[PDB]
Ligand binder design. Structure first.
Ligand SMILES: Cc1ccc2nc(N)sc2c1
Ligand SMILES: Cc1ccc2nc(N)sc2c1
Lengths: 539, 539
């Protein structure tokens, strides 16, 4: 039975192939047929191309050698450099091929990329570096000819492949677009697939593995494995350290989760935003995960939380970041925009609207007026909600993290009922949004500090109201995005209806059939909305 | 006696002032004198400018209000927006004023910036954000009118200042360029300085504090306080985690220290390179500080160290970084350029030359041929150098870290003498390069793993030679910088003489009167050379 799948890069995981560029160049320049593809393979195993592929020489050293092999006289302005630059640049990931490799790995397969490639020292080498970065992360192994000093079709590279896989040949599927490179794998006893068009190749792959790879439902975006992330720690004041996970390069994007969450609530956004060209900083907010959790209520007022986030930027040497928040994180991000506009490149909130403080009413009065905000009154008394939320962590997270159609907690008459989970099962079912392993990650994070620091975010109503009143004459004039979720029955879309009075240039996003837990309920759509907005408004 | 110094921003720590822009605009546009400066101060304490300065409104809301106050009819293409944008943009740090504030703080003074400023939401706000970032880091406090809701000359802001300083008025020097804003500080009993030209202001400051501030020797670049840095951690494989310190935004610059050092050996470079527009990642190399230190010799061969640095980039989501190394770090960086050019944006080495492996001689033979490399033979036997280096850490670092004229260790006949420190004092004097506190930082770092992992870097001669021989047909064609140190008697400048044969486009730097410990011996010159090279060759 098959347990490993091997993919070539050129013409398999990445399209169009280079062989399908030299042929097109010959045609465009009306040169004799196969001239360029012959100069490319001249000298065979002893030629300049084999030396390049084995890592003996770099791509920039290979360019003049390819020109000599090319020397029916060639045109006036010919450049092997220009042809190869354009070819490499045009080559993109073959998304359905990658999707099939992802599915096989998800089902227990060991996956690998085996490729005849070069050491790229061209001034434009970053393009290919980025491509390989994106692809390699999805595979157990990447075997490059220039790094191993062996090339396909040499029999040694196939034995090297089997040794790295720790598998017998009959346990391996080998996909390649070059018949000659497929030949040694077959002779060894491996299942082989000659890749011409992707669809046929995947039909052959589905037939041999017995796993559905074609016509499959839309896959979820790439997630995060906590142990594979870069973890950052900044002391913002003597007893307060902030933890964050960091991925990517480009403009800084600071992700701020809500209650009772984690940096991990952004797991589907972190790889997507980094791939989109941003440096993502996903915070554990004060009171959570690996960040400090002081017990004092006042340590969690918006004024102090915002000051600490400014100190966080100061210590990392960041003059600005784009701030994206959800729930309490969304509230924080609007206040960062109002009090520290110079430090905020742009601001986006998921679910949480911007509603100016009412100076003519106490915040307690305003919360009491809306039945859906009853849970916030239940959270007021120190110790009550901590005891209910800390009693059984697995039950807490399984009851909370549910999609709109999954018997979501009721939040009216929480005080009258005497708790959030009083009418909830002791062993709730697992939501379609989360795996048991994801629930256990939140359980392990909350074992450190519990719910005191997180609940304290709700315990500064009067303090936050007095601070917010200082901003009543201001408008938000920096780039801003409000994302509403149709089925969030607490942070309803309608609550955001007057935002343009205070944020005149506001841009919007709206997600249908989306509950409170936006990032994990609808990850693909969140990613689409945020990336589109970042690329147009945040640079 | 004075113990606190307070500085204004506009016209004191930053020049030219905005008052010295509205006057110049009037003159350039032939408008009546004081017209613009009158429209700017219209309504006095009740006017639009006071509201802006107290934080009631933002700068973008203030622009139309300033235009109404401006409304001898004004020209056709007038813009308050364009005038203020250009004014803010032209304003730069007043370096001798900053240098005096730095000296007072170094001598025990509490320093603060007290400024009438605004909430900047202009599309160009980052310029001012960057300026404030750079300035604020050097002071104990930053008091901004728009954040405190109080302005100079109101008496409340001065009482607020004294409260934040925790000092009596007679203990405070207050420097301001506006006579009216100086008046309330004087009436309170503070020493005041009316700042017109910097030199006169500093003569007055020197006279009142009794500290030399003018005509002082060239100051050292800003250093790092370990507890104020962002600390990052990446697991590169099951038992190996790499620690790094991170500062700044822009292209990634990876700093790789030598033996027996730390990320802290780059303390003078980290703030300078981040300020220059780069994202600095200063590593604790494998075997050091907070990075993992496995005991096996093979874990420290160049092939594995380089593979781990590629994994480090992969996990951080970086397609490339510029790699800058010193000593063993310099050796690593040349091999990163040779084996992973696609991942190396540019490469620079301090002291360590690039010398291709000799396939016709064993590396032991080559090291034996040069008397200055004797210490490397002494480092071969596992346990011998560990015992001598670990016996007294303070003695180890004080004996090693010395400038060229400070009885530097002799490195010939180390084996014959039976150790590095056999002819060295038990209590060496402190080098001019280091403070006792800096020595104690290295002592504390080396208490975790000792010298086994670090010494193992020298213990892979044959392994590194076999790997390097695979690269003999290659050239380094990516941007490269070689920095030589005149007085490094081991890694002599002459050893780099043939580098252009293998790196034809090589750029150079040379530092006179510089020993082996380049970064701390000559920090200002290292910073100048690296920043100039980064800005021209690394983008
Ligand atoms: C804190 C919070 C807010 C909204 C919400 N909506 C749910 N269905 S559970 C829940 C929890
Ligand atoms: C490891 C090493 C290399 C050069 C050197 N030069 C000195 N003066 S101490 C020292 C130590």
């Amino acid at each position: 039975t098959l347990r490993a799948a091997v993919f070539d890069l050129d013409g398999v995981l990445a399209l169009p192939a280079v062989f399908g560029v030299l042929g097109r160049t010959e045609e465009a320049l009306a040169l004799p047929r196969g001239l360029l593809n012959d100069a490319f393979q001249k000298g065979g195993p002893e030629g300049a191309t084999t030396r390049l592929m084995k890592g003996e020489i770099t791509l920039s050293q290979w360019i003049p050698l390819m020109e000599e092999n090319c020397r029916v006289c060639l045109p006036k302005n010919f450049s092997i450099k220009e042809i190869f630059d354009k070819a490499i640049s045009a080559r993109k990931i073959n998304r359905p091929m990658l999707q099939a490799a992802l599915m096989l790995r998800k089902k227990g397969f060991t996956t690998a990329i085996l490729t005849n490639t070069w050491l790229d020292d061209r001034a434009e080498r970053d393009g290919l570096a980025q491509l390989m970065c994106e692809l390699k992360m999805h595979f157990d192994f990447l075997i490059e000819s220039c790094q191993v000093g062996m090339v396909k079709p040499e029999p040694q590279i196939y034995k090297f492949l089997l040794d790295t896989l720790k598998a017998s040949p009959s346990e391996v599927v080998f996909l390649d677009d070059i018949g000659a490179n497929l030949k040694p794998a077959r002779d060894l006893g491996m299942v082989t697939i000659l890749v011409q068009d992707t669809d046929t190749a995947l039909k052959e792959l589905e037939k041999v593995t017995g796993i559905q790879l074609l016509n499959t439902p839309a896959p979820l975006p790439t997630s995060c494995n906590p142990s594979d992330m870069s973890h950052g720690y900044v002391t913002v004041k003597p007893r307060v350290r902030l933890h964050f996970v960091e991925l990517g390069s480009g403009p800084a994007v600071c992700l701020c989760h809500g209650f009772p969450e984690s940096w991990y609530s952004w797991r589907y956004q972190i790889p997507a935003l980094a791939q989109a060209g941003y440096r993502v900083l996903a915070m554990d907010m004060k009171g959570y995960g690996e960040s400090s959790a002081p017990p004092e209520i006042e340590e969690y007022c918006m004024e102090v939380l915002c000051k600490e986030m400014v100190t966080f930027l100061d210590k990392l040497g960041l003059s600005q970041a784009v701030f994206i928040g959800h729930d309490w994180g969304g509230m924080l991000v609007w206040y960062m925009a109002l009090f520290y506009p110079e430090r905020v490149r742009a601001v986006a909130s998921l679910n949480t609207p911007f509603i100016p403080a009412n100076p003519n009413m106490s915040p307690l009065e305003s919360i009491k007026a809306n039945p859906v905000f009853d849970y916030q009154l239940y959270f007021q008394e120190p110790g009550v909600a901590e005891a209910e939320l800390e009693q059984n962590l697995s039950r807490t997270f399984k009851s909370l993290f549910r999609a709109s159609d999954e018997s979501v907690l009721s939040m009216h008459k929480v005080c009258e009922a005497g708790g959030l989970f009083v009418n909830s099962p002791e062993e709730p079912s697992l939501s379609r949004m989360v795996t048991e392993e994801e629930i256990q990650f939140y359980v392990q994070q909350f074992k450190k500090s519990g719910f005191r620091g997180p609940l304290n975010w709700y315990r500064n109503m009067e303090r936050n109201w007095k601070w917010a009143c200082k901003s009543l004459g201001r408008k938000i004039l920096i780039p801003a995005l409000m994302v509403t979720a149709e089925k969030d029955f607490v942070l309803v879309p309608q609550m955001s209806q007057h935002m343009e009075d205070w944020i005149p240039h506001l841009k919007r996003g709206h997600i249908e059939d989306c509950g409170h837990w936006t990032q994990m309920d609808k990850p693909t759509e969140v990613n689409q909305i945020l990336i589109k907005w970042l690329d147009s408004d945040a640079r």
